[PDB]
A paper describes a structure:
Here, a microfluidic device is described that enables the production of crystals by counter-diffusion and their direct on-chip analysis by serial crystallography at room temperature. Furthermore, the crystal structures of four proteins and an RNA were determined based on serial data collected on four synchrotron beamlines, demonstrating the general applicability of this multipurpose chip concept.
Tb-Xo4 was added to the protein solution before filling the channels. It triggered the nucleation and the growth of large PhP1 crystals, which completely filled the available volume. An added value for macromolecules crystallized in the presence of Xo4 is the strong luminescence when illuminated by UV light. Final crystal structures were obtained either from a single large crystal and two wedges (Nb02) or from combining partial data sets from several individual crystals (RNA, CCA, Lip and PhP1). In the latter case, the use of ccCluster considerably facilitated the choice of partial data sets to be merged.
Author numbering:
A (entry chain B), B (entry chain C), C (entry chain C), D (entry chain A), E (entry chain B), F (entry chain A): 1 to 166
Amino acid sequence: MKVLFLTANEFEDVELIYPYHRLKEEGHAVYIASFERGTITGKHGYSVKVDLTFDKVNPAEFDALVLPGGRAPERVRLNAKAVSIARKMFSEGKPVASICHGPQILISAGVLRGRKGTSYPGIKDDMINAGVEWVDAEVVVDGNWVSSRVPADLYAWMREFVKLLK
Amino acid sequence: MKVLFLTANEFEDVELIYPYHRLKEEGHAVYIASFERGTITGKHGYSVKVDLTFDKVNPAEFDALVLPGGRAPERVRLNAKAVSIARKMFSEGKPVASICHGPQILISAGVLRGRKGTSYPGIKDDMINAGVEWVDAEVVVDGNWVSSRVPADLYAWMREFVKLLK
Amino acid sequence: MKVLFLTANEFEDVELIYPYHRLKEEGHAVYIASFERGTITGKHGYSVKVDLTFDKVNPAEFDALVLPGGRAPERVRLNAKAVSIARKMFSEGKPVASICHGPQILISAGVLRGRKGTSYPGIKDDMINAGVEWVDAEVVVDGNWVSSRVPADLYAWMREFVKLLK
Amino acid sequence: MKVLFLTANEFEDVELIYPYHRLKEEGHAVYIASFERGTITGKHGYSVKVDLTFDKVNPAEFDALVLPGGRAPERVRLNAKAVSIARKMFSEGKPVASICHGPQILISAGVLRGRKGTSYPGIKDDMINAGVEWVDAEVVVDGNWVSSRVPADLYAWMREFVKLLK
Amino acid sequence: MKVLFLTANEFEDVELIYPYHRLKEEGHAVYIASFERGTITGKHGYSVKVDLTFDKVNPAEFDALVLPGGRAPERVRLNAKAVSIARKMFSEGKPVASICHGPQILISAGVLRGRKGTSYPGIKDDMINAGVEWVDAEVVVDGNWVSSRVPADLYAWMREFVKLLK
Amino acid sequence: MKVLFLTANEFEDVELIYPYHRLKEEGHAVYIASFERGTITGKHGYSVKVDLTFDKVNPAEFDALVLPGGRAPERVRLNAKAVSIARKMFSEGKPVASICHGPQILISAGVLRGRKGTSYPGIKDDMINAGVEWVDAEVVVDGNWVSSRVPADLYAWMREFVKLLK
């Protein structure tokens, strides 16, 4: 499968790097999309190369979506093209994985009312106001939506997600 | 007047320090409340002393409330006592000043339905979902609630808040 | 009024940002002058844009002068044009505000003989040797010269300087 | 299985965190051993809790061994007990994964003569002088010994190691 | 000889470490005095152990004095016991080496009027107001006083100083 | 004499700066060689200018060689030209000083079999496997080869090296 990541500077480093490698283990192709080509740098100083910009993404060409956390989702969610990608892929029923602040992008896409999931506890009230049935669990599977809360949850986050790509 | 600040580590430094001194200039008493007595440190490394904890605050004893930004509001808003302080003071009509991520504490208080205000743009969708009529202005006055967006609005933010304390 | 700031990289961040906004509140125009156009960054990482260089400043065009601290005054004071600006404005009776290491620029201007003021305590011996009657107070007003010591004096520093601009 | 990590301060953060979670996903128990109980911190600032000290480790009680990289291996390899843990588990045929600087501990254990593997290229000449047949590949499997070079190899590293624990 | 250093946190690292080792090469005993026992840390993060506090120094027991730069001299020069040590040793004619901001301590001792020397150029006007004949040179020898300006001067600074201890 | 340094980014700052100045004191010329012209930066933030790149170095034109430590030796030792510079000067009997990780370049040059010396203890087993008789001492002199372990050894390191250039 082709797996797309939406992110930017100040991503939470391990929430990007862990799924990136865990999905390559399975043989999937992984793509990093951001505002500009070049490199982006995490909160803790790991740098990754950007594969394409939001403007060049055709959502039809990707099979699954990963939304890491950090401070990056508060900037990505103000980009109409990035929010449009997540709206389309989530509403088409493609697998979507989010963790920590990552679902702020789905809040802004307007796709979450009635869905069941989790997030960083610091934004649970915002999830609830977007209509989420919010659950305090290390991983929640709701149809195509796999969500987790914090870096401690990584093992469970990707355990469930990889099942949906098989 | 006795002006109370609700904050914690990783406050945005100038959004705490600027209103602290601007209000001291007017002769008001300023108190920093947080989780624990001691010092708290800002995103940029400035330190300040905590006057009292959230448990020891009696909202009746204070006349106004200031909610600086940074990352601290996402922690504060998870503390039931801190949120109750903000609920009582805001709903009793006492003047409340908020900037950048500050109003996340008011979202969790449940007091923003049908009110008008602003915030850091990265959380404008969460403000709208809480019931806020969201405005892109350097300062917004809506009764007792004075709201601003970013550090560049500091001059206008306190210009309007100072008037409500006369 | 047109208020001029003389500064450079490694300014003490709140000693620039606090008077910048406090004076904007009053409706004054504030200009940052430095060695080169662009941005300058403070000790704690805040950045601000340079409005004009020292070479393009005509002291006749400005009404007041602010000299923040940090490590920048030790560089500024070596620039003959920056020192000449401070000499002319201070000796023409225009209001001048200085804090922490700020008055090092006035020492090099040669205009402090027999004047009364304060500074960061770590340079009080250099103030005395320049001819200053040195006072340990949160703010000192001596004609046109308003002087303070450390960031904890900000509220009193601008309280007194604002009066001279009315 | 019970999986043991030998490490210390200044480990390469993702070379510890990634196998940690990848092996919890399979249901294995994971134990971090270092010099002292408490927490250790990686080169990039992530912190993990130490489960037991080197002195308390009985190699017989553990089924597999992971040696992450960073600078920590140059300090671990000076601790005679830690080197004997590695020596015992490796020579008993138990699965051992090493990456980047990790195999420096195995050099010091004296168990690599005639074996085949890789490492951070910066220490390849030291691997060769310890008797290793050194290969430039993203992962090498030599019996019980799974070796990789750098953080970009993580996906392949644990892909092969996980097979040996089934 | 017994060589005494007066310093504190935020010394310029190489201006302390270079003379420390250069003087041990010759067989002299070197002692670090500061406010408190324990360790002090330079601007660039090197740490050194403090041998004794200002309170325990008997100036008669030391043969020569070294004053490194950094931000530390602005704190040391406010300590009456530290300034007293430098006053006594310099006025008794013992060898004294200073660099960069180091002579701020001698300014405060009141021993420099009529002497010839150099400093960091940023404080040359303060040297002049203390009565120094100020010279722009990599090293100046004036009787017992060897002075230099910046880290680039280290080689010449200690070349001349070691001659005075022979 | 003309003295050559082989190094790169992330050198141990004082292991380069101290021999640099100590050898200028004697009147020797000193040249920094690295991968690219411009500046390189040490682990602690000090910057030095690169005089020439490895490709332009003719070993015949230089009389002595210094190998500082840090992480830079693990990158320099992968550059075939830099290793051949070290190999040529060392085997021609020219004076060579190494400290901490520095001798990793000499391991890769193949010139240490049967020689006597020291290093950072963290790589002593690698020195032993390269054929060195490894000694725990602050300085070792083996013909043209002066070796030390750590920054605390600087005084002794250059004390012995300076003798070989007279």
